[PDB]
Amino acid sequence: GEPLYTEQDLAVNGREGFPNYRIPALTVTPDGDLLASYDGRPTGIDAPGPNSILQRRSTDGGRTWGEQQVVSAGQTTAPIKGFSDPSYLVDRETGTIFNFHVYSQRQGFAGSRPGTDPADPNVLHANVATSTDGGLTWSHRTITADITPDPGWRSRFAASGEGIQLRYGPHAGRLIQQYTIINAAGAFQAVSVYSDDHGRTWRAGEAVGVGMDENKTVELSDGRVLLNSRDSARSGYRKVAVSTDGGHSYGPVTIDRDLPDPTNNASIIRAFPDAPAGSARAKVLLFSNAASQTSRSQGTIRMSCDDGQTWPVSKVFQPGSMSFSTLTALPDGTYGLLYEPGTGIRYANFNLAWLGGICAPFTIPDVALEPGQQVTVPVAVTNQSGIAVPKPSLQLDASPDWQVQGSVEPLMPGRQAKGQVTITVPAGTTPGRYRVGATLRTSAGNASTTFTVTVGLLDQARMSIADVDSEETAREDGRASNVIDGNPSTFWHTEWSRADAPGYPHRISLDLGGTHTISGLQYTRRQNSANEQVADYEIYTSLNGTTWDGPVASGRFTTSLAPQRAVFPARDARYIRLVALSEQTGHKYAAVAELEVEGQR
């Protein structure tokens, strides 16, 4: 219907008792009252800041808000106490409300030491406040010893925002709160902490993943539990995993390249949390995060209508500063959104009509071509909307001088639709990888996708590592093969975890999988770190793998984050070798996110 988006501040830094306010948690009580919670930070820091958990209630569906109250009061006088990083969880069967948060004294998350005793001042404790009166008053407990079944778990905190209650399946009624832990190897792991007796007792399931951080769970149309996590190893995306046992244990963790993220919190909720299992509505998810890889800005709502397999719909709600954000579904069918604009804590309301999307995810294959050429690629629209669309159009976004055009056949409820894109690349186009955005426009809303057009590059999927001088595999994944996976987010990194690792020169050699006319190498430096950057280099080629011709090119790369070209007169080769002679500021290691080869495939 009529689009709604409205916003109001609930806490402004410096006003009402605190110089800084952060870390939003938002819920709707069984009453329909809204509760917003967040930290008061007297010293403006995370734990062990002597922080308070605070709370405002709205009893008119979000429009006006009552006084800021204290849920858990920090102690600014020695001995210091801090309570920080709230997450609400409503038990909608009993009505009891929970607010999870840290109890810190001397140590925060990084500094916490092994041990579970409630009074240990060097332990970052796991606390929870329980309300049996709709969030008006609160009792308090430390559950650290209940949720630390591994003595090597020296640290934990509840991921702030909002936990869930399961509605489906053998574990219906389970309360699930996400936590992050630090194990004895010092890896950050995710784990669900859950209660099956309505909050009386809590336990941890099995920890999952490495390079995890604040993570969130949601129940899918089929009762599976989807985990969606911040990556503390800073890939520039979200991490994901799924459980088939109600949160007890998760399958393998993967990087989700549909969801750019700058290492920041986020929220994932059911659009229709009361929809029955397996129903079309049960499959609808909303996601909120900063949709940038390098900054906490471009806050964006995405929608999936297939239990999170695809995210065809997105809309920006905050082009500027946008840090933590947390969604909840309101009784009136609209959505609550509590987030950090930079000046404290702000609350927004929006409806689906504002989002403006259509559940019609679509695919366009990646395609490779030569300068000058024209190719037509197929478009497949999977229509999940249930509605007929007689006049879809496809709008494409490509290089300013490329000829692109597209079209889609009418959409039919429950059916796949065919389309086509025709692309002409002008002669003289620089070899490289080109992202093309595509929008499906309909009177019932829009969906989008991207696809890659490769001009004058060899196919990486035919390549393999012929040799490498050095690679770290023990303390991180710096495999040489990471240069040819088509992902700027994974990288080769020379060995670093032993002191006897070599320094420069470093060397990586690719087998192209067969002989090609080649004329260039494209280097992309590591994206999330700046002290392993190749400077001086040479490139050699070979027909047999053993007799190397060259250097066929040499120079000095810049610090640019974009692919860098090193071109050479065209020749036939089956192998190409990069010799990295130096690092930009004289450091010991090399790291390369991607190597592309210019040539006739």
What's the Rg (C-alpha) of the chain?
26
Residue window 409-438: x/- pattern of binding to ligand DAN, with contact defined by CB under 6 A: ------------------------------
Residue window 518-557: x/- pattern of binding to ligand DAN, with contact defined by CB under 6 A: ----------------------------------------
Binding partner at 504 among ligand DAN, Na ion, none, C-beta below 5 to 8 Å by kind: none
Binding partner at 237 among Na ion, ligand DAN, none, C-beta below 5 to 8 Å by kind: none
Please pick, from the candidates 103, 138, 157, 287, the single residue that binds ligand DAN as defined by CB under 6 A.
Answer: 157
How many CB atoms sit inside 10 A of residue 168's CB?
Answer: 17
* Distance of closest approach, residue 296 Cβ to ligand DAN, in angstroms: 8
C-alpha span between 271 and 36 (Å, rounded): 19
Map the footprint of ligand DAN across residues 228-257, applying CB under 6 A: 232
C-alpha span between 243 and 227 (Å, rounded): 8
Closer CB to ligand DAN, residue 158 or residue 417? 158
C-alpha span between 122 and 145 (Å, rounded): 15
Amino acid, res. 285: L
* Distance of closest approach, residue 136 Cβ to ligand DAN, in angstroms: 26
* Distance of closest approach, residue 232 Cβ to Na ion, in angstroms: 19
* Distance of closest approach, residue 230 Cβ to ligand DAN, in angstroms: 7
Map the footprint of ligand DAN across residues 31-50, applying CB under 6 A: 46-47
Assess whether the previous peptide bond of 3 is cis (omega < 30° from 0): no
* Distance of closest approach, residue 411 Cβ to ligand DAN, in angstroms: 42
Binding partner at 490 among Na ion, ligand DAN, none, C-beta below 5 to 8 Å by kind: Na ion
Binding partner at 399 among ligand DAN, Na ion, none, C-beta below 5 to 8 Å by kind: none
How many CB atoms sit inside 10 A of residue 418's CB?
Answer: 11
Closer CB to ligand DAN, residue 47 or residue 348? 47
C-alpha span between 557 and 583 (Å, rounded): 10
* Distance of closest approach, residue 77 Cβ to ligand DAN, in angstroms: 22
Residue window 43-82: x/- pattern of binding to ligand DAN, with contact defined by CB under 6 A: ---xx-----------------------------------
* Binding piece for ligand DAN, criterion CB under 6 A, among 27-35, 101-109, 248-256, 399-407: 101-109
- In the three-class reduction of DSSP (H, G, I as helix; E, B as strand; rest coil), residue 484 is classed as helix
Binding partner at 85 among ligand DAN, Na ion, none, C-beta below 5 to 8 Å by kind: ligand DAN
C-alpha span between 151 and 184 (Å, rounded): 9
How many CB atoms sit inside 10 A of residue 401's CB?
Answer: 10
Tell whether residue 579 is a contact of ligand DAN (CB under 6 A).
no
* Distance of closest approach, residue 252 Cβ to ligand DAN, in angstroms: 21
- In the three-class reduction of DSSP (H, G, I as helix; E, B as strand; rest coil), residue 352 is classed as helix
Total number of residues binding ligand DAN (CB under 6 A)?
A: 12
- In the three-class reduction of DSSP (H, G, I as helix; E, B as strand; rest coil), residue 582 is classed as coil
Map the footprint of ligand DAN across residues 103-142, applying CB under 6 A: 108-109
**Roughly how many angstroms between the first and final C-alpha of the chain, as a whole number?**
51
- Dig out the tokens for 533 from the structure: 């950057």
Closer CB to Na ion, residue 193 or residue 593? 593
Please pick, from the candidates 10, 11, 23, 269, the single residue that binds ligand DAN as defined by CB under 6 A.
Answer: 23
Q: Are strands 432-442 and 393-397 parallel, antiparallel or unpaired?
A: antiparallel
Tell whether residue 219 is a contact of ligand DAN (CB under 6 A).
no
Type and span of the H or E element at 353: helix 352-355
C-alpha span between 284 and 269 (Å, rounded): 9
In the sheet that 445-455 helps form, which strands lie side by side, from edge to edge?
Answer: 367-369, 445-455, 432-442, 393-397
Residues at the site binding Na ion, with contacts judged by CB under 5 A? 482, 485, 487, 490, 593-594
* Distance of closest approach, residue 366 Cβ to ligand DAN, in angstroms: 34
Q: State how far the alpha carbon of 268 is from the alpha carbons of 217, 327, 354, 482, in Å.
A: 7, 7, 18, 30
C-alpha span between 384 and 435 (Å, rounded): 25
Tell whether residue 377 is a contact of ligand DAN (CB under 6 A).
no
Closer CB to Na ion, residue 219 or residue 594? 594
Contacts with 277 (C-beta within 8 Å, 6 or more apart), sequence order? 167, 168, 169, 221, 222, 223
C-alpha span between 327 and 305 (Å, rounded): 17
Please pick, from the candidates 28, 36, 56, 85, the single residue that binds ligand DAN as defined by CB under 6 A.
Answer: 85
Binding partner at 108 among Na ion, ligand DAN, none, C-beta below 5 to 8 Å by kind: ligand DAN
Closer CB to Na ion, residue 201 or residue 294? 294
Closer CB to ligand DAN, residue 107 or residue 460? 107
- Dig out the tokens for 46 from the structure: 């995370």
Closer CB to ligand DAN, residue 179 or residue 523? 179
Of the candidates 53, 50, 49, the one whose C-alpha atom is nearest the C-alpha of residue 39 is 53
Closer CB to ligand DAN, residue 291 or residue 480? 291
Q: Which DSSP state fits 534?
A: B
For tokens 């009792």, what's the residue? 139
Please pick, from the candidates 25, 26, 54, 102, the single residue that binds ligand DAN as defined by CB under 6 A.
Answer: 102
To 5 degrees, how large is the angle CA 363–CA 365–CA 370?
Answer: 150
C-alpha span between 37 and 24 (Å, rounded): 6
Of the candidates 474, 479, 509, 507, the one whose C-alpha atom is nearest the C-alpha of residue 493 is 479
Binding partner at 34 among ligand DAN, Na ion, none, C-beta below 5 to 8 Å by kind: none
* 357 in Cβ contact with 445 (< 8 Å): yes
Binding partner at 487 among Na ion, ligand DAN, none, C-beta below 5 to 8 Å by kind: Na ion
What are the backbone angles phi and psi of residue 325, rounded to the nearest 5°?
-150, 150
C-alpha span between 166 and 177 (Å, rounded): 11
Closer CB to Na ion, residue 464 or residue 515? 464
Binding partner at 213 among ligand DAN, Na ion, none, C-beta below 5 to 8 Å by kind: ligand DAN
Closer CB to ligand DAN, residue 341 or residue 445? 341
Closer CB to ligand DAN, residue 65 or residue 324? 324
Binding residues for ligand DAN, rule: CB under 6 A, are: 23, 46-47, 84-85, 102, 108-109, 157, 213-214, 232
